[PDB]
Amino acid sequence: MMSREADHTIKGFLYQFNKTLNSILSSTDQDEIQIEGIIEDIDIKNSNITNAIQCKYHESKVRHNLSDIYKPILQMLLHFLENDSLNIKYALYAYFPNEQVGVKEVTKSQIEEILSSSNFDYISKYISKIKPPKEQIIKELLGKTSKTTEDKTRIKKYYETSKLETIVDIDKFLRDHFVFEIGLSYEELMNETKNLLMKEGFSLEDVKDLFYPNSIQYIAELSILPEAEKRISSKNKLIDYLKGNKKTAMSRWTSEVLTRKQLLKVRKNQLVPSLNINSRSRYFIIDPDTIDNFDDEFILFVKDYLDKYNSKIKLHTETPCFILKTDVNNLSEYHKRFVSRNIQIITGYIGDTFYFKEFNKEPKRIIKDNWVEFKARISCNSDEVIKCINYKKCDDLYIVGGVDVSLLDTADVNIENLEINNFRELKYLLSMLKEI
Template sequence: MSRSANYTIQGFIYQFNKTLLEVLNGSDESEITVEGIIEDIEVKTDLVTKAIQCKYHETKEKFTLSCIYKPILQMMDHFHSNSNADIEYRLFVHFPNEKIGTKQFLSSEDIETIFKSSDKNLKKLIEKNSEKNHTEFCKRFTVEFGPSLDELIKSIYKALVENGMPESDLESLIYPNSIQKIAELSILREPHQRVILKKDLLNELLKVKKASLSRWTKELRTLDKIMKLKKQQLRINLTKNSRLRYFIISVDTIENFNENIVTFICEYLTKYHFKEIHDKTPVFCLDCPLDIYLNIIQRLHRKKVKVNDGLVAGIFDKGKFIIDPVRGKISKSFYREFDLKLIHFDKEAIGIINECKCEDCFLFMENLPGELDTEDINIEHMYINEIEKIKFIMGMSDTYE
């Protein structure tokens, strides 16, 4: 991951954490909008709406006004289009050398300095607002210097406990799922869908049982604890000998997918599908280019893995794919017609998965397929990029370093 991409992710993580803290510290009646119409966070009460934009400058040694020209101009522009609304504008920023909790206000000199900027990206905003009276906006605008991400998380832990969450589950279960909930709300299309109340969040968190491994929770400082909890949770069903399991794995999610997938499948079979009592054939559905998929079948064959890909004379036959393998003993050796079923990800594959229900469906991809029927099956949806981490949570290795 590039440095700029990492900074972007950390910025979102900081924003989600600040949003979560606003929810936890708010009143029961306050409506918090994630990714609001105005700013990153909107806190609406009967009297006023507080619009908050977050900026995380972990690597900046010193605060300068120029670092926040753009958000100031954006807020100013919104104010002049909605000057009759009761809105307070807050810029919540972190700079390592600024004292936490201190506030800064805009002066007329600051406004003049901003409008003298030669930044081409700000030209339109400057031209649109430079001739307006900004006295009232300055009264409503505040810069607040926030804590580091680590300190912000400590405040969240404290707030979670104060709101009745069990302290023992904070780092591995409650906190990660809180962040995941905020992240899920942030991508919903309609503003009303992104509104959350404290009581609703707390009720939802009390019902959470599964550790969350998503695009966002895997970036948290507590990832190791999340991984270990997930491994413990998955072990309950993975240790059951007779259990039908499906795997849907995306090439876009797994790093070095083509280099690792064959080894992963073989190691899974060695761990979980080698005894006579292992009577449910695992299904691997691979979301990858067709040429890579066909190459994987060839490589499995060279590894002496017997695959049912459902093909008859080069044409996929559903009936052949869904049948169970012939099993029996030859002399003292156990014989199985095939070791796994392999299918290329498409609508037909999802249709078969929906029709022939499994007990556990493991999905290693960013988003659940919209057509997937999740009723009456155990869904384990995880966004993990590294194959070693997948092996770890699946109980196939003792470490992921």
């Protein structure tokens, strides 16, 4: 039994995507959108909030069957019970092959007859919170961890019979904090979206794999910035061209499963051209607790990276470097776990003192044998190691998880943000794992 909060988050994400795509379609001149704004978090310092809306629809039906929009409206009213400060502009979006497109007749009576719902799930979830019962027995029954059939029947009879009021201003919610427009289904509008995007030069599959997800994410990221005044937009064609440049610039950070299998993929084919050069310097900035089972799998991942990218004695002349995000300690245990596996690394730390000359030395190698002094550099995220990294710049820098890229000069360095969940994903993105 999965938690309903995850399902609500999934529905909110689907609304975020479809509303963002609507804004992209309507982005012609001076849009100034405020897509989404609530992630069910603690701090709401800057509102920048549209709503936590959902888009649900059945297979096919002329009318809205029965008890269809009850879940979203109940959740919206419960959320409104703790809503204040700036107005939050609620909405509800849906598809119907044959229905009135636009605002529906929603003034007062609809909610009074929705509030007359008598479902056990609705009462247990949102009706009880919105309309508290007038009996201590019902209050005790609701708070019980386990409810029996007799308790549920008594509950249902009490709510159906007893007229229970509420303290939330319903009419205020209906007048402003709601709107319900029958829209179009964006699954079938993908072709039209591609056709509208197919107005510049671009390419056939480049829009599908590279441009559309980047536009969707960049527009969706317009409202996540801490500054609330960053949404100023005018002449949407010019900002569309700017996003055209930005999509080629970033070329990553895709959300949905578009063209992409397993858990993460499709970014693999873009990393291949860089991962095919022998004499290249690759620095990794890993953030542990962002990867599942990091302690027991980091060493194996390192071994499988070095037996593919640091095997050749004459062509692989660049030493990899893995800057983790931990304390100055906890490097001794990794060093011990590497020594036990016959892998030679250097940390640059003797106890707690860092040594500049011990971290920038080039490993002496002997070509008649297959000996290199050390095969990797592994250190923490301190300031001195970052200074060492800036002193000897890399060609590619891979950011795994969320790490502050500041204090790192990016003169001629290609930044490659890689979000992952486990080491199978990272192995698959680096072309050392054919399958998942």
